[PDB]
């Protein structure tokens, strides 16, 4: 059954916990991976825990850097780990009947992404400006049987190429350029939101994309002072209700300690910097890092919306926390 | 297919032996997790272990206790177990179409039980009194596509609040305050019988609580000699027949040493300390621990009625020695 | 789809190798079982090699010992072996819906056998003699649904109590004692036959017995010179064609060394000491050990026949080979 | 479904990584087979690696050689891997409903390939010279329900006999001798193309054969310069395009180093040593080895022909890389 992703995002009113996978302590003496830049995607049936290893076990870009798998809350051990594809940088979703998987490998002057499909190949984008061809890190969007993400080649300190595509059944068959001077988009997060792509990616505040299925976009910076225009980084997300926004961020403005959600009702639009709810994910005294979102669909949930779910990594990587948003009562997480 | 209950409990004769893990052989050289609070649940296709861990190897409340589950008899291993939920206290049951788990997680003094069904986050509780939301450590008790479940909140040496739950795929629809005053519930071990909850608690003799549909409830203390009223301690359970009760115990009234199973047949209601049948479960000369009951009902066996079966805690956690009733010749056991 | 069993057994020509665990070098560094008394016995679906073990694993009766088992030819290890039974002594069979299993349990002098199917306990026999309540260590058979065993209490250097066995569903419905002076019937290897059961046992040249699905019953031994009554001993088995036969023994008469496969068309009947082929399994410079007989139903095989198969284990236990009949060309093993 | 194979061979522009499995990094620590001569074959539902081990395990023709597999990409370890036949010599494929195995076991003057379908052993073939009978070590091609193969017997530095078979559902239905007089044959890669079957093979330039489903033949070697009569050796394919090939090769001439593709337009019938495109699969500066082909058949794959791919094994045997065509844009691979 083809996922739809008609159904608007739900509401919430806080994040309750959903999985934490304890490896660091478990690998100190069994066969545990040293994982990168993990991620989640959520299928109809399951959840699923994607990354990047270098092949190495604990305790113990490349052409030996590969993308595997393994449920979300078990231990990446090579005797669990399913594999997927060979990358230095890569993203997954999946469209309601099998998984979707993009996968760069290659020169750094010369990267192509290879677009897999239930395992077999069945196409590939070549690098365009031929500099560091790279992809979101993240769950890819699909919406009616068709997946979306944003691919970027050039400077991550400068102007660099932007494409946005359509994918279906593992074949591209829509593309465009972004005409997006000034702006800076790498390492989207993307979901779906009644039939349409919200992206919110960083800047090297948040910039945003968003698009229709025919590939019609439009842009602009989070507006909240949690300008409208722009004020190195760090991936994170965002999630859009009407004028209203929830930002996920570190709780230090010198680094990547500590992690809190701040409910901002007029943020999307408005520049003030007053917010109503802020929630505590990660204490000021834990090391936090790289965060985004990712969801549950309708025909995974039960639900009539999709509910809006995300992780952070925890600093290679050592561990991986996540949370979905609840409508009941919730309280602040050290 | 959704489980019924109305089926009374199965008649028993005596106790014979159905799973002993050995994982501290197993995990002298190998790698196992070090468990504890293990209970055993089962849905109509098979039954599992479920335990609490720390996310520690043998030789090798906290924000890092999870919640995992093996197939019964299995060894708790990283590389078998099934990741369930995050919490330092934790139930399970199944309804007959999915798992239900509850998990509380959080502060001391604002703990939530997070509800989740088939792996999803449907609902949340949040503390009450403020003081350790605690539930069952046990299966909790299905009957018509709706689960039971006993949660208490305040101190363990005195009065605390007990509220009676009903949960409908993953929601709470139903619940109550219990007016049970000098009445001390922790720890409830609960069976479906006749389409009636009956639960027998530790009250730190035995406490009992038994409810409908309509968390309509009436309870006492089992007044067997082995008072109807209350005459520290450790979680246990008994079955109730009519006026019959088997009560399961320790042989030592000093220490957690030894097990046996004795049949009063007027124990229930009766004050004498007269009895039948006594059946040994584990040696004196060995320790035991805690102990708890659970159910495979017809759905599962393909009987006429709901079989009653139980386990105890060889004591961290060592082993988990499980029992089922049976109406033909069985031996005592060292 | 219960299994018929009504279709003779399968004419061979020679033996052919099946399958080879490999344990022992893969367990020197990896995570191995110690096994003992390994059987093998196959479902409509797959083969599978059940082993009881102490708990313990490779480079590290008793109420510690308990029936486990993996798919033919894979290593029995801690991290794939399934859970079946508690017992110092064992047998399984699969009737074509689920697996029975027999498992006996406690004291020398009390011992009783739980009969589980499908998991489930479903019935259990106490000892009649009180002495070392013992079964098979093979598959059982099973004819239309229905599936049979051969059960002893007494003593191995004297006369003992025999009983055969008639289960369905995991419910013993008909049993009867032998009349069998003199006879002695120990660890029988059975195989069904044109809707009859045959068995040969060892006495402690090789009795046998066979009968029908009312437990009528007829006996002798296996006259062939490789006397029709009697003249220590090893587990071992033997295949009827008519008036041949195909014994199975080792090569040396005063140890447990090689194995050979011996075709005497006049053997279960005459006394003579011709035989016609010998075909070589295990080298005379190697150790064998305990053998042991299984099938593969039509339902399993696609054939119009009953294709025998057989294992030898090779001395705890180390190895455990095994292999099937076949009517086309095949060579002597070393 | 049984696989149809009247498709011809998808055209290609290059080739795409697909798989990469890092075993000896995760084996320094874990617990990973020494693999040797490791192949690819796919299913209708998924594509695994078959390789041949010793039983031993890393930082530590025989009876103990066994035939075991896991999923493509997966470390073969242990705890994954799935047995398969008894074998110093092997091939593997399926027929759309099922796995058909051949492995060759035994004396060197008396070898048995014993022919196994879904586990069963179902016929078997006697050495015809009894010199080292072995097979393609290799991907067996399925056309129409039925598989081929090619087996040889004799001297590897002389003229031996060679055998096509026709095997069905694990029968040999149909086998012919050839002549083929001062040929050599061996170590055959094999792919069906529009209902034919087309073979490469070891000369100890590359010979070929080809032949249809009643065992047709005709023969003779691929003309390019990259004679078309004949000019030790290693393992090797080539894709045939009308009178176009895409030879695969090593760039060192005197060492198993590097690995290239080119196609070469009219190379199959020209003798000129003329090509369009190299593309390169490993540095010339890195170990190569062995090579071979495989294909993934429109029930797998979706599409209307059938997919090319190709294995090279990294040198015992330490990785194993494969690839596979795209008619997309695809860069070299260093
Ligand atoms: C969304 O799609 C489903 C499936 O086609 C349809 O039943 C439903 O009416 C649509 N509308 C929404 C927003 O629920
Ligand atoms: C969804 O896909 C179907 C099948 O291609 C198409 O007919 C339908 O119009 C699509 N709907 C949208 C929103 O594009
Ligand atoms: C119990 O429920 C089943 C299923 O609805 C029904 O067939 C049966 O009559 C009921 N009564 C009992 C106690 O068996
Ligand atoms: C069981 O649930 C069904 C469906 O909600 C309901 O109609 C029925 O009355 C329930 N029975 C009981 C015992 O509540
Ligand atoms: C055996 O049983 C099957 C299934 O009932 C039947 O079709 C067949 O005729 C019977 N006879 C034999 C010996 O094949
Ligand atoms: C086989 O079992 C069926 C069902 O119980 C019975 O009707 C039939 O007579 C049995 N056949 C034999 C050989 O007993
Ligand atoms: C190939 O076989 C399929 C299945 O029988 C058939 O539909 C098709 O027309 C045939 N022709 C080709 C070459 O596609
Ligand atoms: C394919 O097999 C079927 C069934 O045996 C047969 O009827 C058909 O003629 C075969 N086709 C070819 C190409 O041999």
Redo the contacts with the bound molecule.
């Keep these: 059954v083809?996922l739809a992703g008609?159904s608007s995002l739900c509401p919430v009113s806080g994040w309750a916990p959903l999985s934490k996978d304890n490896s660091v302590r478990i690998g100190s003496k069994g066969d545990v991976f040293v994982i990168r830049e993990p991620f989640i995607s959520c299928s109809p049936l399951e959840c699923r825990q994607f990354f990047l290893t270098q092949g190495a076990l604990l305790n113990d870009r490349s052409p030996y850097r590969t993308l595997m798998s393994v449920p979300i809350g078990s231990v990446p051990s090579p005797y669990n780990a399913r594999f997927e594809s060979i990358a230095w940088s890569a993203s997954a979703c999946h469209d309601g009947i099998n998984w979707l998987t993009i996968g760069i490998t290659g020169p750094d002057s010369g990267a192509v992404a290879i677009l897999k499909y239930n395992g077999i190949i069945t196409d590939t984008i070549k690098s365009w400006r031929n500099n560091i061809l790279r992809t979101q890190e993240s769950e890819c969007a699909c919406?009616?049987?068709?997946c979306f993400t944003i691919m970027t080649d050039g400077p991550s300190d400068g102007q660099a190429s932007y494409k946005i595509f359509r994918i279906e059944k593992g074949k591209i068959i829509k593309s465009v350029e972004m005409k997006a001077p000034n702006y800076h988009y790498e390492e989207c997060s993307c979901y779906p939101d009644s039939?349409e792509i919200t992206c919110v990616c960083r800047d090297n505040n948040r910039p945003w994309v968003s698009f229709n299925?025919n590939l019609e976009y439009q842009m602009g910076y989070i507006c909240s002072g949690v300008s409208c225009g722009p004020v190195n980084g760090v991936k994170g997300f965002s999630f859009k209700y009407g004028n209203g926004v929830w930002i996920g961020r570190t709780k230090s403005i010198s680094s990547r300690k500590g992690f809190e959600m701040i409910w901002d009702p007029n943020g999307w639009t408005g520049t003030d910097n007053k917010f109503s709810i802020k929630q505590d994910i990660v204490g000021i005294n834990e090391w936090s890092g790289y965060s985004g979102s990712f969801v549950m669909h309708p025909e995974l949930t039960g639900l009539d919306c999709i509910v809006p779910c995300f992780w952070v990594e925890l600093i290679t990587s050592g561990s991986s926390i996540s949370f979905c948003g609840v409508n009941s009562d919730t309280v602040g997480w050290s």
């Design positions: 083809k008609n919406v009616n049987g068709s039939s299925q």
